[PDB]
Paper text:
Riboflavin is essential in all organisms as a precursor for flavocoenzymes. More specifically, LS catalyzes the condensation of 5-amino-6-ribityl­amino-2,4(1H,3H)-pyrimidinedione with 3,4-dihydroxy­butanone 4-phosphate (compound 2), affording 6,7-dimethyl-8-ribityllumazine (compound 3), and riboflavin synthase catalyzes the dismutation of two molecules of compound 3 to form one molecule each of riboflavin (compound 4) and compound 1. Catalysis occurs in equivalent active sites, which are located at the interfaces of adjacent subunits in the pentamers. Owing to the absence of the riboflavin-biosynthesis pathway in animals, the enzymes of the pathway are potential targets for anti-infective therapy and riboflavin-biosynthesis inhibitors should be exempt from target-related toxicity.
The BaLS monomer is comprised of 153 amino acids and shows the typical α/β/α-sandwich topology of known LS orthologues. The N-terminus of each subunit forms an extra β-strand extending to the β-sheet of the adjacent subunit. The symmetry-related α3 helices of each pentameric ensemble of icosahedral BaLS surround a central channel. The central part of the channel wall is formed by the side chains of five Lys97 residues, creating a positively charged patch whose charge is compensated by the side chains of Glu94. 12 pentameric blocks make up one icosahedral particle with a diameter of about 157 Å, which is rather similar to the previously determined sizes of icosahedral LSs [160 Å for LS from S. oleracea, 154 Å for LS from A. aeolicus and 156 Å for LS from B. subtilis]. The characteristic icosahedral ionic contacts described in detail by Zhang et al. are well conserved in the BaLS structure, although there is one fewer positively charged Arg residue compared with LS from the hyperthermophilic bacterium A. aeolicus. BaLS was crystallized from phosphate buffer. In the resulting structure, we found electron-density peaks at the 5σ level in each of the 90 active sites in the asymmetric unit. These densities were interpreted and refined as inorganic phosphate ions. The binding mode of the phosphate ion found in the BaLS structure is very similar to the phosphate-binding modes described in published LS structures.
Residue numbers in the entry:
A (entry chain AE), B (entry chain AA), C (entry chain AB), D (entry chain AL), E (entry chain AK), F (entry chain AV), ...: 2 to 153
Write the structure that this text describes.
């Protein structure tokens, strides 16, 4: 009874990508832009905020949701396993932040941060075998934008 | 003593299903009808919201309980182990959302999200030798909503 | 040196028991509902709230503490390992809502939910080798109750 | 399309439980005698017939269906592997008299007799991991009852 | 509720024993007396029919229940695994007879035929560490006959 | 030839059950308190004495036989192997006071205390594979009672 | 029915502890106070007798129950496996004394002597993951003394 | 630059200790005395709150620091690995509570709860090889107290 | 509240040593005498009775306790493992006798009989690595003499 | 009773550090500052003496404490295993000197010389996992200083 439209010609999205692991987040962003752009979203109704890395993505995502300028916010980034458990707390707090601070703002905030073990797994999901996580995040932002933003 | 009825003659239930793994969630939403319906709930008093996937189920599950139109909100979806720990942060936040944000609404929000390791296990719990976890999550939904009398 | 009493001559206790795994939670309730009685708490001053299972125990346990009718609330239930990580998110959220979440009320909420690996392990704490964890969770309730500092 | 109802507001149910392995059949009966109650079937409109064990359940189950006092009869019992093939002939004849033999009456007779290998397996269906097969056999009774075509 | 007495003060029981394996069935018929007798049944109200072996126990067990002289008919005998599958077809038909032809008589016909793999197992169940299956089949006989009140 | 009766129409029985391992002793008592009832012993002529555990069963069992109010006293309890030899001294002293120590009274005292190795073994005699040893210990009580020679 | 209170408001308990293994018996006597005390027993109504070791605990435990000053006598101590069978004859006689000489006094003498194989096991049962066997032996002491009403 | 003082002459401290694992938490509380004492704090100018389990610490640690009574609150307790994952949900929520609810008050709440795998590891950190983690959490408490200083 | 004095200047002890294994009992006695002597006991208030071996030590120990001349009796001896189980019954009856016949006389009778496996274990405990069991028995007799003989 | 104070406000301390293994002894001297400082001692009211090797410490540790300049002298240094037994004669004589020649002066001389096998073990005890054994030897110095007290 309540499906979400997938055409976002009149939408207005804003994304926050993490500079760390640029090698991956780059192609990850281009896929999200390409997605929104070719789904109707105007090529300039789209803003991008570069943060130091995923840990920083919850703070600035909240600053773009509370700015009340966008119809949806897309969080992009990439985290890869290291030698320490540092990778765990980062990955957690990013999702923990993006998810929890997506209800505090009743604004669709799509979580599109890669959390992998191998550099080959990131590439795998940045426009390779698995597809482009970024593009898939945009197509998700548009849908949420029809079901969650202008819907109440 | 404070048991809860199982006859939902005059209840209004709202369901939120994730499209990802539709192969499972589809026959898992078969717990809605042939479940709520056979227990009394009216065909028309049941609304369904399709979200992109489990991560987006806390937000829309909120904007359905807060609409005050439903006595209880059933949350459906399916998540299966990948190669990355991405599966973990998702399952966590879905459960973390449906739970921690079921106390802020005082409205019963039944957690019926399959979190499995195999496609086979998801099938085992969607109408096979474990039964349908969508039908069971409805029975629980009725009882819960029907148990909120020492409330208000 | 502020310690807690242990005789509950005039106490008002409320219990929330999960129906799932009734085979265990049954004897588990009888442990508390017989530890309270024999500790001087009235057999007629105890209320029991049957919820579907543990995941629903935070919600109903809240509406009993917020009910402002009990000095302490005991939460009884049983969760046993499955084949999926479903077991983890359940245990977590139960021992998370019940767990310290319920500090908000400032009513004692004793966490007495069995979280085991084997049906044989749960049966060990259900009134066997390790003793009845329901009885022990009632003794904890009386003690917690008899601890009075109030915020104001 | 002739399907079956599931609310049993005005139902007349009869139960035949085998005393042997009372440790299991006990909780097994409580499953049906609590699934019926909470499904709207009268706590005062249920009769229970204790037979020595399963082998005698076909005979007494017959004199209850032939009694023409119940819309459906539930058969509860438990049989566990021994060292001899004695277990086989018992299980067979129970799930043979009860089983389709009792078509002659045209009164619904639900076969809810546990036939397992381990005491731990029977304890799994007695209200644990696999759920209470007595509760499920009561839900089946209500449904079967609410299926009315009559031969004449 | 429909339990069955265990005092057979004024009952009339008829027993049918197979000669084959007399070594076992003999001390197995010791369940008749020192069983029925000690439970009240009169010494004289007990008749015994010796048949060639178990296969011939359905026929003669029939011409004893149909004589309407006995409140219940106890069937005794012993069968042990051979080298051929002959053991199977025998045990089957004995149980198949005593059961399927206990509904056509409405008179309780207790099945007390040992079906084992070892001479040792037959002994285990004729008055050794498993007890006497003839004495147990009498206790059941009394209760059964004593339970046929919602009959006729 | 002085043998013992088995119908206890007019009997006065007393039972001492150990609370420890209530999970087993529970069903274990129900075995005796249902074997007595169905053997013609009054449901209203049975007293039960709950002691901490088996070690205390000799003392309280004494004050019931010395009470001179019962024809026989049944002792129910359960003790299971631990990591220490503590289990041995308990079992010993229970089956030593209860055991023949209580010849002094000349009142029948039936030793029905389970002394096993596994929780699964105790559960076997608690009304499963091996039968209910409480029921059997009641049948022994009635028989012992019906044995009258008196010293004087 | 003859249960026993757990509130020892007006009881007089006497404890007998063995010095040997003071490292364990010390924190094991911590079951006396913070045990009897928290259950009601008066600080002053509790006397303690220090004996050389467990072997000397039957004699002095006798000259405390026979003084008729205490409602119940708690016996504490610890014994651990050596290289010789000396450990056996000790544990035996301690238990043999406290038991067999608790019927000659009619006064509840709770046996709370640790009989273990490891220093670690003694610790496990003196306030670690098994709890404090001194506190448990007090709870039992209260109930026992509080259960001697069908006495005298 | 803002270092924290270590001489706590004029300080009011509050301690919350868990009764479970008293064998360890006892000597662990020995960190309060012979700890706060020698650092200047006034003899019993410090209050100690005994709570049942480590799980109950967060609640009472609050209702002490909640309203100005102390300049800093210390939490002491011990938790040791069991067979079940119960150990995890306890440890987590204790640390979770003491930490998360040390920001809401703004009054220094030092986390001093031992979380070990072995009883030998608890002893290892209760005054053994690693020192006393109670005396160390006291030093921390004083330093943190002297850091309520704000900034310039 | 009831500790035992350790100075026995005015005491009057008597011991019974077993001649068998003189090689050990010798140094075992000298340690007991040396102990009593250097603890105050007058060097002539001390008597020694040589019995054939440990089995004989219960009889003559009773003859020295019933002689009402001593303040305590010390039983010394040594038993070592042989090829037969003879060693077991001897060791048992000695302790069984000394302990049981220490309550029949309400007179402190210290059990100091070595019960070992190796000749090297006896020497080990006769004034070697483990100390002198005899000396330790005297220091025990003196204490019991203050708590048990002139105390009542 | 004579405990040692821990607040060293008005204290003069002297430190002798070894230059060899400066990489470790450096951070080890960090125990002086941020150690004596926070315990009350006045900023650079403490003198530091740098000596070539740990072997030269005893001499200069003397010619400092030798004549009243400080209330206590701390010796810091590090020695790590080599291929030769040279490591032993150094460690020994350092400890030998600092100890033996701490009685002749009577002025507290705390021994704080690391004697490890690995460079990783030195780091382990220089501010890592085990803490800083320099800050610990400072606490000791203050306490020992406050114990120049003599006796009454």
């Amino acid at each position: 009874v309540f499906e979400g439209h997938l055409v976002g010609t009149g939408l207005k999205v804003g994304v926050v990508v993490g500079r760390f692991n640029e090698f991956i987040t780059s192609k990850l962003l281009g896929g999200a832009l390409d997605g929104l752009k070719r789904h109707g979203v105007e090529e300039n109704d789209i803003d991008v905020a570069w943060v130091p890395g995923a840990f920083e993505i919850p703070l600035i995502a909240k600053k773009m949701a509370n700015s009340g300028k966008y119809d949806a916010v897309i969080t992009l980034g990439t985290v890869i396993r290291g030698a320490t458990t540092h990778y765990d707390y980062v990955c957690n707090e990013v999702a923990k932040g993006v998810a929890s601070l997506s209800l505090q703002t009743d604004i669709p905030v799509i979580f599109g941060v890669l959390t992998t073990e191998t550099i080959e797994q990131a590439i795998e999901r940045a426009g390779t075998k698995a597809g482009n996580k970024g593009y898939e995040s945009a197509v998700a932002a548009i849908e949420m934008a029809h079901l969650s933003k202008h819907w109440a």
